[model samples]
Target: EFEKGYQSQLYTEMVGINNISKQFILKNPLDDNQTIKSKLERFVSGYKMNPKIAEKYNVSVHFVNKEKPRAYSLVGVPKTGTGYTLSVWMNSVGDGYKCRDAASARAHLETLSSDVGCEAF
Candidate 1:
């Protein structure tokens, strides 16, 4: 079942990317948007390839170190898809990854999981 209190109306496959580990998409107005926002400040701090809070939550963040124009993507996208979060691609411009604002990457992961806190795996 979808995580409760997170307002996860649709738990479908992520837009792009493929085969890394877990896959998911998080909608806003989450259970605790405030807390999610707070964690993103550090987890995805600097908007780089940081997983300060990804591994634990079943969400994975990806980063295109050296690619043409790079790509934008949210956590749990997929291996081939560069399963990076919005935070990862915040520096570049990838149509698939450029869905959220700045911190909304990890923020999405923050509320993408279960109790205690939110998302990750």
Candidate 2:
């Protein structure tokens, strides 16, 4: 399975810099757009490396420091290629090292996996 139950149809992998791990982060409406995934992939292909994204968002960068995989609640993605959702995995960095461990990541990810409302992960 992809993440958040399934994967999207539209996606563009970013090459060159593989430090920071990110699927689709700058889509309009955050998942309200049907073409968001395609556009996101396109954006990813054309995405410029931003060290700040990691510094600011606290995301991982490459195998060194990257966003941990965790299933995020998806209720907005429309088509098979649009919208987005986080997946379950591991990250080098998180809100804190305490949150970086796989166990911690799983706990947090499972919490997000719940059917609760939207939240910031």
Candidate 3:
């Protein structure tokens, strides 16, 4: 299901109005546009990879070392033909070793899964 219960029709339809008309809808509508399933899937999809690893996918994982001090990120992206991506962040303050371990990954994955609102992913 789409996030925020947003469907494309509402935002897409608001695109072509001039200022006067646009102001009418001061609300200003706008339009917008992955579970780890495999071991190789998770392994090949994360960050800190060497050049050989980076070459395999269209988009790769990126780890954020700090935005809030000692923070770590684990991202996994697979090659889906979709035009965009979805990114979600969590601050567990624990080691992000789940990016490698399946059990912890699965548990965390389920814990974070929900319609937590975003257009991509």
Candidate 4:
């Protein structure tokens, strides 16, 4: 899953392209006047198709900013030739009974308190 996140970021960004960027090469590897748009289109299409898997595992499809809950995305999209790409970020929240289902949420909330130096509902 982590690899998926990493590759997703790579596929979505133009970073590392100038010195040794794959996106640039993918766009102009052969210099045959090919556009990067289609490659990006395919990538997004694939992600949308498998969104359910991510959601099921509590793997958020979006990134949330710790400072501002709503800021939610640090992902940067850079342009490579005629196409734009996106970014991905990963972090560990530590472990202590975390789950996305309602049953789990209920159980967690029972013993959970906002006074524990952490945010909560």
Candidate 5:
């Protein structure tokens, strides 16, 4: 009986924590396109020394991209070129695969974070 009671209390606490986290997400939510565009730019500014930063930033930034099974990477979309001519790298390991815009880049980062088990980000 004691063990059962302890388990029950643990479950209740877990539920409370989950609810609080949910509330936080609902309150802060994701930023507007303009704000996201700007913040995303800053988030990915220093991806050389710390490749993990890119993944970390992506987990935080949220956007609307209905694409399924999104690809995660340090992508480089040409500043002036067709979308078909874009390129992406697995990670921020080397030069090249830089994203030209913030929106797309942020999306990729978020996907990477999710892929790496940081689903909350």
Candidate 6:
């Protein structure tokens, strides 16, 4: 379950659209690390979407986590030329542990963190 913290200083502010993504001290459940085509998927799925980043700053940053925490993200989006678009992302906080799965190792490594890191696996 996602814990809606507060407005995000990171998400950036804009007209027409509202912003505020939780710190992810929360959790987003998913079937696979990558599987949105299935149906109505939530956090963990969206976290991996990486379309592109342009002037709109509609993107994300990603990297591995280390002690003292680090920074990471996967930037992407689908925009329609119409009204406006919503920039979505997932930011992880902190934790400890390390892993990686083979065919499924990816599922394994995506979890268990370090000092404080964030974003999709």
lDDT of each: 0.29, 0.28, 0.27, 0.29, 0.31, 0.27
Off by over 4 Å in 6: 1-10, 13-30, 36-56, 61-90, 94-121
Q: Per-residue lDDT for 66-114 in model 4, tens only?
A: 3222222112222234222222222222112222222333233323354
Clashing pairs in 3: 86-121
**Which candidate do you rate higher for TM-score, 2 or 3?**
3
Instruction: Give per-residue lDDT, candidate 1, residue 47.
Output: 32
For model 2, what is the alpha-carbon lDDT of residue 69?
Answer: 18
Best by TM-score: 5
lDDT tens per residue, model 2, 38-85: 443353345443442222122212222122212121111222233323
**What is the full ranking by lDDT, best candidate first?**
5, 1, 4, 2, 6, 3
lDDT of 3 by residue, 82-101 (tens): 32233222222322221222
Q: Tell me model 3's lDDT, rounded to 2 decimals.
A: 0.27
After the best TM-score superposition of candidate 1, give how far the Cα of residue 18 lies from its true spot, in angstroms: 18
lDDT of 6 at 112: 28
Instruction: Looking at model 6, report the run of 10 residues with the lowest lDDT sum.
Output: 1-10
What local lDDT score does residue 109 receive in model 1, on the 0 to 100 scale? 33
For residues 1-121, what per-residue lDDT tens digits would candidate 5 score against the true structure? 5433332332233233334433433564465545434444444332232242222222221234423112112333223332222222222222122222334443454333332311111
| lDDT tens digits by residue: candidate 1, 41-65 | 3343233222433221233434432
Q: Quote each prediction's TM-score.
A: 0.19, 0.20, 0.22, 0.20, 0.26, 0.21
The alpha-carbon deviation from the true structure for residue 47 of candidate 4, after best TM-score superposition, in angstroms, is: 3.6
